C-alpha cells in the first residue's frame, strides 16, 4: 500500500450513503473521526443528498467554513467530517437538530427534533477499564468518553450524554427484555426487545431479538445496541419503528396508503 | 539491508520460493550491539514511528537488583565471565541479555552494613533498636557471604543494551548461583 488511503470512489463507498454512479467517479472520503469508515455518514454527503440544502461541493465547504453549522456542540469545520450512528447535529438557523439514526431498510435516516433531544443523546459502551493514576474510564462508539464512571457500568451497556457536561445522567445495562437497536448486518435498523443470549464461550455471542410482530431473529453481540427499557424509548424512534415487515404486506400497504 | 521476512527462506517442503516482492523498509534488520566495557557511547537510532532506540556501546556502569534484599544499586561491571549463548562473547567481553558478569558491589556492601550492621568475616539507640528488629535474617548463604568477602558479586545482566542502552541486571541467588558456579567449575 506504501501508505494510508486518501481517496474513495463511487461504487466502492458504503451502500447506505446512496451515491449515484454517474455525476462523478470519486466519493467523499471521511478522514479520521469518531466513527468507522463504513458505518458513518460524512457531513458533505449528508447535506448534499439527504436534505438538498446545498447542491455544490463549493457551497457545502463555504457553509462549513462560515460556521453556520455545528456538531455535538462543536463547529468542526471539516469538509468531510464523519458523523455516524447516534450523532446529533443542531442547526442554529431555525434551531433544528438532526439525529443520524438507522431506518428500517438499512440506510442513514435523519430525524429532525428540538433542543431537548439535541442536548441529550445515547451512546454504547465498548469497553471499561482502568487508566493511569488508578482512573477508571469507558469507551463509546463515537469516542465520547466520560471519566470516572459509576462502578455498575460494564461492557455492552448504554449511557446518556448531555453533550455539555461530563456526567452520565442515565445508564441502562444488558439483560433480558430491553428495547434494542441492531446496527450491523442485514437487520440494520430494527427494534426487537432482546429476549436471551447464547454466549458461545470464546467470543461471537448470539442474541435472540424479536420484533413486536413476533418476528424473531438472531444477531451478533457486536451489532446490538440497547437504546432503552421496554415500552418508552430513551430517544424518539424513527418512522417505521424498525419493523421490517413482510414483502407482500408491505407492498400492499404501499399500494393502499401510497 | 538485513532482511527479516521468510520469503527469502526456503519453504517447509524444501522448495525454493521465487522472488515475489522486493524487500521493504518494514522487515529491515540492523547490526548487533557488541557492547564493550568502559567509556559509555550510547548511540540513538530512529525506528519506525519514531521511538528512538538506544544502541549501547562500551557500557560502563549498570543497575543491579538484589531480589532477596529488595534493593537495586548502580554498580560498575568488572567483566563478563559466562554467557550461555556463545563463548566468543565471553572472550571478547561483550554485554548481552542474560549474561553472567561480575560487579564491584561496594554500594551493596555499604547498604548491607547500613541495613543490618552485622559483623562479617572472622551507634545511636534508634540504630540499635532498628538493627535488632532487622536482625535474625542475615543468613543468606555461605556462597553469597564468601562472594561478598571476595568483593565481586555474580550478576545476570538481563536488560537489552541494544534496545535501551542499560545493562540492568539481578544478583545471582540460590539455585541460579549454584548452577552457574557449577558450570563455571565444570569443563
Amino acid at each position: 500500500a506504501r501508505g494510508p488511503k486518501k481517496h474513495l470512489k463511487r461504487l466502492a463507498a458504503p451502500h447506505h450513503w446512496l451515491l449515484d454512479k454517474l455525476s462523478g467517479c470519486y466519493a467523499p472520503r471521511p478522514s479520521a473521526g469518531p466513527h468507522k469508515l463504513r458505518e458513518s455518514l460524512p457531513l458533505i454527503v449528508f447535506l448534499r443528498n439527504r436534505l438538498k440544502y446545498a447542491l455544490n461541493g463549493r457551497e457545502v465547504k463555504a457553509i462549513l467554513m462560515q460556521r453556520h453549522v455545528k456538531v455535538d456542540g462543536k463547529v468542526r469545520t471539516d469538509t468531510t467530517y464523519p458523523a455516524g450512528f447516534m450523532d446529533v447535529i443542531t442547526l442554529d438557523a431555525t434551531n433544528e437538530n438532526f439525529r443520524l439514526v438507522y431506518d428500517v431498510k438499512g440506510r442513514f435516516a435523519v430525524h429532525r427534533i428540538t433542543d431537548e433531544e439535541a442536548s441529550y443523546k445515547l451512546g454504547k459502551v465498548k469497553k471499561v477499564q482502568l487508566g493511569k493514576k488508578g482512573v477508571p474510564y469507558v469507551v463509546t462508539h463515537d469516542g465520547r468518553t466520560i471519566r470516572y464512571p459509576d462502578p455498575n457500568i460494564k461492557v455492552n451497556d448504554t449511557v446518556k450524554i448531555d453533550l455539555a457536561s461530563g456526567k452520565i445522567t442515565d445508564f441502562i445495562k444488558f439483560d433480558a427484555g430491553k428495547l434494542v437497536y441492531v446496527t450491523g448486518g442485514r437487520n440494520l435498523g430494527r427494534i426487537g426487545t432482546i429476549v436471551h443470549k447464547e454466549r458461545h464461550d470464546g467470543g461471537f455471542d448470539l442474541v435472540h431479538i424479536k420484533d413486536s410482530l413476533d418476528n424473531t431473529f438472531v444477531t451478533r453481540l457486536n451489532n446490538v445496541f440497547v437504546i432503552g427499557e421496554q415500552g418508552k424509548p430513551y430517544i424518539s424512534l424513527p418512522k417505521g419503528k424498525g419493523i421490517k415487515l413482510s414483502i407482500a404486506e408491505e407492498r400492499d400497504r404501499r399500494r393502499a396508503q401510497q | 539491508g538485513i532482511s527479516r521476512d521468510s520469503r527469502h527462506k526456503r519453504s517447509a517442503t524444501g522448495a525454493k520460493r521465487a522472488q515475489f516482492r522486493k524487500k521493504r523498509k518494514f522487515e529491515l534488520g540492523r547490526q548487533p550491539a557488541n557492547t564493550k566495557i568502559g567509556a559509555k557511547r550510547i548511540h540513538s537510532v530512529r525506528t519506525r514511528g519514531g521511538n528512538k532506540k538506544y544502541r549501547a556501546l562500551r557500557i560502563e556502569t549498570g543497575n543491579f537488583s538484589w531480589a532477596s534484599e529488595g534493593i537495586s544499586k548502580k554498580t560498575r561491571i568488572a567483566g563478563v565471565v559466562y554467557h550461555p549463548s556463545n563463548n566468543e562473547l565471553v572472550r571478547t567481553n561483550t554485554l548481552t541479555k542474560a549474561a553472567i558478569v561480575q560487579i564491584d558491589a561496594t554500594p551493596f556492601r555499604q547498604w548491607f552494613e547500613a541495613h543490618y550492621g552485622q559483623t562479617l568475616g572472622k551507634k545511636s539507640k534508634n540504630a540499635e533498636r532498628k538493627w535488632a528488629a532487622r536482625a535474625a535474617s542475615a543468613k543468606i548463604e555461605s556462597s553469597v557471604e564468601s562472594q561478598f568477602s571476595a568483593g565481586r558479586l555474580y550478576a545476570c545482566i538481563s536488560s537489552r543494551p541494544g534496545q535501551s542502552g542499560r545493562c540492568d541486571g539481578y544478583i545471582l541467588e540460590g539455585e541460579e548461583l549454584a548452577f552457574y558456579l557449577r558450570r563455571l567449575t565444570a569443563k
Partner: protein, 142 residues
Amino acid sequence: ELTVQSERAFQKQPHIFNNPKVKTSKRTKRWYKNAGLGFKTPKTAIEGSYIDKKCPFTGLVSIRGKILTGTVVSTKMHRTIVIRRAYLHYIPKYNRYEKRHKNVPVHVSPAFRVQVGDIVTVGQCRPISKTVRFNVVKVSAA
C-alpha cells in the same frame, strides 16, 4: 528433555521468584494458568519440574483462534509433533469427494506424553517457530 537443566542456560519461568533467604513451606514457586475454552490443566503440568517457556499451561504463550483435532504421525522431533488432519474436499462437477490430508506441526508440552496414533486437539497461538503455529491442549489416546 531427560533433565530440567540440560541446557547451558538456566530454565525458569520469567518474572516469578522464590526467596532463598526465607524458609517457608512449598519453597519453590511455579506458575500455571487456565488455557480457557474449558480445557483442564493436568496434574503433570500443575506439579511438574519442566519449564517449557513455550507451553500453554505454564509458559508465556496464549491460546486463542482456531481449534483443531488430528492424529499425530511423527514424534522424533523434540518438544513438538505433527498432527494429521484427514479432511475431504468436495468438487462440484462430479458431485463427490476426495481424501486430502494436511500435515500441520504442533508444539506439545511435557505435560502430555504422545505416541504415534494418538488423537490430539490443538489450539492456535502466536507463531511459535518457522512451521509450528499450534499448541497441544489435550490428548485422548491411552
